Amino acid sequence: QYGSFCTQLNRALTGIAVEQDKNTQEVFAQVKQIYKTPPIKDFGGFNFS
Amino acid sequence: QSLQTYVTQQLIRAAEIRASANLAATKMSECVLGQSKRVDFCGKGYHLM
Amino acid sequence: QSLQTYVTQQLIRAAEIRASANLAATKMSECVLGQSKRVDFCGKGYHLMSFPQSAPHGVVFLHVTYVPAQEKNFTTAPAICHDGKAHFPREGVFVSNGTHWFVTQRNFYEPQIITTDNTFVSGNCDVVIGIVNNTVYDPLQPELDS
Amino acid sequence: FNGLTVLPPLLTDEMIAQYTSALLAGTITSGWTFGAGPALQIPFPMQMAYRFNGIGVTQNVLYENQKLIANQFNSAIGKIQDSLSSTPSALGKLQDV
Amino acid sequence: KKFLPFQQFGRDIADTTDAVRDPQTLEILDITPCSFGGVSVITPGTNTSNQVAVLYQGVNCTEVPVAITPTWRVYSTGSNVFQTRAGCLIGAEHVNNSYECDIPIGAGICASYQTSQSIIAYTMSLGAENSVAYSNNSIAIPTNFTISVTTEILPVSMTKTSVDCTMYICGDSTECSNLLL
Ligand SMILES: *[C@@H]1O[C@H](CO)[C@@H](O[C@@H]2O[C@H](CO)[C@@H](O)[C@H](O)[C@H]2NC(C)=O)[C@H](O)[C@H]1NC(C)=O
Ligand SMILES: *[C@@H]1O[C@H](CO)[C@@H](O[C@@H]2O[C@H](CO)[C@@H](O)[C@H](O)[C@H]2NC(C)=O)[C@H](O)[C@H]1NC(C)=O
Ligand SMILES: *[C@@H]1O[C@H](CO)[C@@H](O[C@@H]2O[C@H](CO)[C@@H](O)[C@H](O)[C@H]2NC(C)=O)[C@H](O)[C@H]1NC(C)=O
Ligand SMILES: *[C@@H]1O[C@H](CO)[C@@H](O[C@@H]2O[C@H](CO)[C@@H](O)[C@H](O)[C@H]2NC(C)=O)[C@H](O)[C@H]1NC(C)=O
Ligand SMILES: *[C@@H]1O[C@H](CO)[C@@H](O)[C@H](O)[C@H]1NC(C)=O
Ligand SMILES: *[C@@H]1O[C@H](CO)[C@@H](O)[C@H](O)[C@H]1NC(C)=O
Numbered sequence: 001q002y003g004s005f006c007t008q009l010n011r012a013l014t015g016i017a018v019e020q021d022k023n024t025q026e027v028f029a030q031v032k033q034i035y036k037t038p039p040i041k042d043f044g045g046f047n048f049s
Numbered sequence: 050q051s052l053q054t055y056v057t058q059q060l061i062r063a064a065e066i067r068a069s070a071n072l073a074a075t076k077m078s079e080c081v082l083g084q085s086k087r088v089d090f091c092g093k094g095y096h097l098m
Numbered sequence: 099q100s101l102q103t104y105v106t107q108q109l110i111r112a113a114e115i116r117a118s119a120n121l122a123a124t125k126m127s128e129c130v131l132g133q134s135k136r137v138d139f140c141g142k143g144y145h146l147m148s149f150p151q152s153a154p155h156g157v158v159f160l161h162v163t164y165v166p167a168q169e170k171n172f173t174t175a176p177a178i179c180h181d182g183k184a185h186f187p188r189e190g191v192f193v194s195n196g197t198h199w200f201v202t203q204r205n206f207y208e209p210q211i212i213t214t215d216n217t218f219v220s221g222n223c224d225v226v227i228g229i230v231n232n233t234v235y236d237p238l239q240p241e242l243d244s
Numbered sequence: 245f246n247g248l249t250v251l252p253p254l255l256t257d258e259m260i261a262q263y264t265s266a267l268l269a270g271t272i273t274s275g276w277t278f279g280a281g282p283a284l285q286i287p288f289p290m291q292m293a294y295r296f297n298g299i300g301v302t303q304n305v306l307y308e309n310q311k312l313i314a315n316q317f318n319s320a321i322g323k324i325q326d327s328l329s330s331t332p333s334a335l336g337k338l339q340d341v
Numbered sequence: 342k343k344f345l346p347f348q349q350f351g352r353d354i355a356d357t358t359d360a361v362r363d364p365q366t367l368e369i370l371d372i373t374p375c376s377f378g379g380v381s382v383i384t385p386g387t388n389t390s391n392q393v394a395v396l397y398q399g400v401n402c403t404e405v406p407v408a409i410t411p412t413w414r415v416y417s418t419g420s421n422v423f424q425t426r427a428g429c430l431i432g433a434e435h436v437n438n439s440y441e442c443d444i445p446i447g448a449g450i451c452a453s454y455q456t457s458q459s460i461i462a463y464t465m466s467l468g469a470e471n472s473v474a475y476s477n478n479s480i481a482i483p484t485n486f487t488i489s490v491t492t493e494i495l496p497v498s499m500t501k502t503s504v505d506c507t508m509y510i511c512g513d514s515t516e517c518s519n520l521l522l
């Protein structure tokens with residue numbers, strides 16, 4: 001008898017849920033290829049271990 | 050009423066989290082993928098990497 | 099209760115739209131009215147210029163950027179030892195094609211003869227690790243001899 | 245259990261780690277070139293000399309003091325583990341959310 | 342749970358009776374909710390086809406055939422059902438090949454419609470692999486360039502809407518407005 005009070009709540013929660021994945025994607029997926037360091041650590045004395 | 054209060058507070062918190070994530074994405078683009086001249090944006094001192 | 103719910107949701111959405119509009123104003127100020135040095139702010143690549151374009155309830159930016167295309171392998175040297183003195187390039191990088199050494203700018207291949215106006219002398223060549231070992235030219239001397 | 249569910253994130257933790265490892269490897273092996281376009285390799289001391297020129301210090305300063313700079317960087321990167329482990333409130337921003 | 346001799350129920354969150362004691366045989370048996378979850382339909386556009394896949398979110402799906410005439414239950418039993426961290430997917434085929442995600446599912450699993458053509462499920466690929474030929478005396482400098490133009494779209498303004506309170510609540514009525522004041 002209250003109409004569509006329930007649908008809006010679920011819609012808002014789903015919007016938040018989608019926004020979270022958008023946030024993670026926009027922060028971390030900034031590179032289009034996957035790069036790997038060479039097996040040799042000749043960095044002129046700089047230790048990145 | 051309890052459900053509506055929960056949803057409203059969740060929306061406000063999600064907005065704040067989105068602002069923080071936008072700042073993090075900007076920092077990843079500027080401090081990590083380049084060298085920034087903006088003062089105190091990438092730590093105290095003259096930014097190197 | 100229905101009216102209150104509608105008003106609250108409108109307020110939240112208006113706050114989001116205001117954040118977007120502030121970002122758009124910043125982009126108009128920094129990408130269109132000038133040349134921006136911030137990375138990835140005005141498009142992918144090295145920013146050159148931008149052009150605004152009006153859209154319904156929004157704006158569109160066309161970002162003109164510079165992208166390097168074709169690269170080549172070379173060998174480098176941090177410095178050059180000529181007469182016991184170490185030479186460093188003023189602006190550019192020492193590069194070799196296998197037999198000779200040149201100075202080029204970093205973002206585009208343009209080899210040049212290593213002379214005293216391309217490099218500056220600082221200290222002695224006993225401290226630099228990996229220094230390479232060549233001749234530099236002073237254009238004043240050949241003119242004086244002639 | 246009263247109608248409440250938690251949904252898994254689209255990106256697993258291993259995928260985030262792979263993304264960060266790719267970013268780190270690109271930064272170490274190519275400097276800032278992999279962000280503008282194709283990645284171009286450059287020796288790390290020369291990249292550091294470029295950064296020194298960027299902050300307004302001439303590049304022979306780094307070549308004359310390379311060992312000291314490397315040692316200072318290694319010590320500084322070693323200290324941060326203890327700095328963040330010793331203080332419980334270092335990672336408070338995530339704990340609050 | 343070690344019940345004390347004078348105790349009858351068990352409550353951990355103070356609104357749910359997680360345990361109870363049988364009246365006749367004095368034995369203690371815990372109570373758990375049967376099962377529940379959301380039902381999502383993975384579908385390409387009604388352009389491409391009419392085949393669909395169904396995901397039962399966050400459930401062990403030995404239970405799916407007997408959950409809840411529209412009794413598809415196991416919609417396509419031939420389509421190998423398999424558990425993911427989001428649930429189990431029914432109507433899609435598992436594939437080893439990895440591609441860029443287009444229809445996200447969860448926990449790194451993505452679904453797509455491709456060639457004959459059917460809905461497949463796979464782990465998303467983060468991008469093409471690459472390795473920079475790093476050495477301590479090698480440089481790469483570009484010998485050419487390209488000029489590129491890219492578009493960026495930003496919303497600026499919303500629609501200016503005004504709503505009258507009395508007209509919406511108590512339209513053209515005086516008793517309603519007197520009660521509303
Ligand atoms: C890079 O630094 C790590 C320390 O973080 C070095 O690992 C140490 O190695 C020595 C001897 O090889 C051990 O006694 C230490 O216990 C190690 N420390 C740790 C934390 O594992 C590593 O050897 C360094 N690598 C280079 C190439 O210098
Ligand atoms: C590296 O570049 C140098 C400079 O151009 C080349 O030396 C010249 O080669 C041309 C042949 O194309 C000759 O006509 C010039 O007389 C050379 N100049 C000098 C000063 O000797 C050299 O051949 C190049 N090496 C390689 C392997 O490409
Ligand atoms: C560049 O040329 C000079 C030649 O003058 C080389 O200097 C010699 O280095 C060796 C090794 O220490 C000494 O034994 C000689 O006495 C040096 N020569 C003179 C005249 O003092 C120098 O080694 C060359 N550079 C490189 C990197 O090989
Ligand atoms: C740099 O790249 C451009 C391509 O963008 C080259 O221009 C092309 O050159 C070929 C033949 O050399 C022509 O058939 C094309 O029509 C050209 N394209 C355009 C858009 O004009 C250019 O030659 C390259 N430069 C160097 C030095 O390699
Ligand atoms: C540069 O050298 C590396 C050495 O492994 C090679 O893989 C790469 O293809 C070379 N690039 C060019 C343009 O010759
Ligand atoms: C580069 O590494 C080689 C070993 O692969 C070494 O012989 C050489 O001295 C190094 N050069 C510099 C400048 O570090």
Ligand SMILES: *[C@@H]1O[C@H](CO)[C@@H](O)[C@H](O)[C@H]1NC(C)=O
Nearest residue numbers: 362363364365366367368369
């Ligand atoms: C009393 O309980 C036992 C089992 O606990 C049951 O078999 C029996 O029928 C019960 N008594 C009556 C009168 O039903």
Ligand SMILES: *[C@@H]1O[C@H](CO)[C@@H](O)[C@H](O)[C@H]1NC(C)=O
Nearest residue numbers: 384385386387388389390391
């Ligand atoms: C959707 O279907 C119609 C029917 O053939 C087709 O003409 C239309 O182009 C399709 N939409 C897209 C985006 O391709």
Ligand SMILES: *[C@@H]1O[C@H](CO)[C@@H](O)[C@H](O)[C@H]1NC(C)=O
Nearest residue numbers: 400401402403404424425426
């Ligand atoms: C629930 O699923 C797991 C696999 O995730 C399986 O080992 C277990 O047997 C299942 N439980 C039941 C009751 O079928």
Ligand SMILES: *[C@@H]1O[C@H](CO)[C@@H](O)[C@H](O)[C@H]1NC(C)=O
Nearest residue numbers: 434435436437438462463464
């Ligand atoms: C992928 O290949 C492995 C063998 O390397 C096999 O065991 C597995 O079943 C395959 N999975 C799919 C979905 O093809």
